[model samples]
Target: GQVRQRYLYTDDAQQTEAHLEIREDGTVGGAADQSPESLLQLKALKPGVIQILGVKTSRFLCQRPDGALYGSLHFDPEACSFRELLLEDGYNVYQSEAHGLPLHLPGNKSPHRDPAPRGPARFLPLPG
Candidate 1:
């Protein structure tokens, strides 16, 4: 069930947009262009929750206590679980189940939980 891969892009304040990317150093950032570093795999434990893994880095996407993103070496449900919500506009939103904060892009100064497709939290899951 963990073979599927996708690229997650979000609307950014910058013109380049935001593509979720996990680095080899266990840090998380958003890439402006599509690259192998940004490729991700999503494992759905349930209909609402998902585990995001970096395809290239082989790490799990994790949410930190300080609102920063982290690339965890191992999967821990408390930091890795994200609740997914599909919006009407075909975009999706992911919120950290532990912190209740939306997954945000580097360019996004603030994050919101509403199902609005234009916000930074709204991610478009592109086929890989």
Candidate 2:
């Protein structure tokens, strides 16, 4: 389909300021949406699967079961794969279909082991 852009905002009120994002080095980081760094390309691979490509770096946001964010050059199993679970509210969860783990962003808004299966992992898209 088409590529969508928005900040991956954690639904938790305590850490809403930080957004899920990635850098050129394949390192995922968090920003309060000050610019394009926090923007992400939500490219859906299927009804629930997707490739979250960073708008600034063109890197796909990938996750390991260890609870960390990584950028991979290609959309291989290691870096780019997700199962979007849209919840009752505006929140959602991105479960790594290959890794068999859920993505969680920490309270500090850290992108490494930083992005959660529970409330912390819940996220939604905001207007760009």
Candidate 3:
């Protein structure tokens, strides 16, 4: 019931093509090579909140001890929940409730890091 309010739009001026995806097999990152698979979806559990689900696995996202992000089966409570905050950039920042950490927003690109300088500067989102 909470998975219906999701859709995707991409940028045409970026000079590249990619979609961020979270997989059932535990792959959470972006792909410059967009494909039919690797579509990630989420629901606004409520305002200022969201629960990311792997479109393939149907499970939600969770984080590890070191704050590594991944998806887990709903075999447990939705520990994989977050509060999304809209930053000055066009993208949103998801802050973990349990771990008290930001979603770090996954990226397959080389040398990704957490606590980014701009905080919401990842995704390279357009200036909001």
Candidate 4:
């Protein structure tokens, strides 16, 4: 009984979408675009469990077990937070004022970006 999570983001916001795919590999797939630093923020969130795959410019993919994924953001861990992910903006988009993090999906358009600055933010610590 394993859980998996994935994040995906496209440079073009109009084309941008995120999904949670539960597959036989025990992995989930979705979209997220943030600065490299923000990605580092994610790394810090999960410690050793997060992996960063540089897919292309302004677009990178991150994969983590469902266990480690939720804690990577400043959100609740026990409840499903996919909707929170969908509602976020800023670092999710490139060239937005939220561009400092460097892990943003490239070439996306949508002003309704994440309303917070890139981290070192607080999140619920993962349970052991």
Candidate 5:
């Protein structure tokens, strides 16, 4: 039997990003790299409102439209768990800061200084 499938690849990196296809069973099919880390982290906690904090990087936070959260090292769903994610060698701004602030900030300030500026809120949804 012959099955047709479409895949997306990135020139910058040699990896298949996604797949869309029709199976021999006469059923349409598709799948993406759903990283185990992402699944584990998301499933680790309860199936309620949760927030994932990217330990090392100041990357975008992953949150459900309903308020569930899941953090990942890389955008790739197949990446390792947050704990396994590589940490920055030097100190990060988040570490130096005493509290969490809005994503967009004008400049850096002391650890106990005033919080950064508040811009448009950008939230994401995790599979819940």
Candidate 6:
């Protein structure tokens, strides 16, 4: 099992900025300005399974059925878990375990749940 800490930088066909972040209030979004919240740790819990940990906030990235992201204080494997998929282009996709929805960066509107194999859901993990 390999454990690494990095920033989840979101990039789609349209945009290539912003990193995934979660707040203490349990809200999750993309931080275009780039802050400490963007720092995340990839915890490989199982084969093709990982838990995203917020470094500063001490929370986990949990996806809801509504496609909403939450910062959970405790690790809830059912919700805080994601299947890490590495694309041929060297990017990664995090699909939720509970609902099987990909994590998307909040664009101008709200974060979408299309899972169309494109858009802000694709992330590049950058090391510190």
Q: Give the TM-score (vs. native) of candidate 5.
A: 0.19
Q: What C-alpha lDDT values do all the predictions have?
A: 0.76, 0.68, 0.54, 0.27, 0.26, 0.75
Pairs in steric clash, model 1: none
Better of 2 and 3 by lDDT: 2
Q: Write the per-residue lDDT of candidate 5 for residues 1-128, one digit (tens) a residue.
A: 12111121212122434222222232222235522222212222222222232322323233222222333334422221122111254211111011222222112243676543533222122332
Alpha-carbon RMSD of each model:
4.7, 4.2, 5.3, 14.2, 18.0, 3.4
Residue 28 CA displacement from its true place in model 3, Å:
2.0
lDDT-sorted candidate list, best first: 1, 6, 2, 3, 4, 5
Off by over 4 Å in 6: 13-16, 106-120
Off by over 4 Å in 5: 1-40, 43-98, 103-116, 126-128
Worst 10 residues of 5 by lDDT: 90-99
Error of 6 at 92 (Å): 0.8
lDDT of 6 at 106: 43
Per-residue lDDT of candidate 6, residues 1-128 (tens digit): 38788877765523645677788787877665678998887899989898888888998888777667888888888888888888898878888877777676544343555444543366778885
User: Considering lDDT, which of the candidate structures 4 and 6 is the better prediction for this target?
Assistant: 6
Best by lDDT: 1
- How well is each residue in 58-87 modelled by candidate 1, as lDDT tens digits? 988887765567888899888789898888
Better of 1 and 2 by TM-score: 1
How far is 42's C-alpha from truth in model 4 (Å)?
A: 11
- Show model 3 residue runs off by greater than 4 Å: 1-17, 75-78, 105-128
All candidates' TM-scores? 0.81, 0.75, 0.61, 0.19, 0.19, 0.82
- Name the TM-score of candidate 2: 0.75
lDDT of 3: 0.54
Highest TM-score scorer: 6
Residue 72 displacement (Å), model 6: 0.7
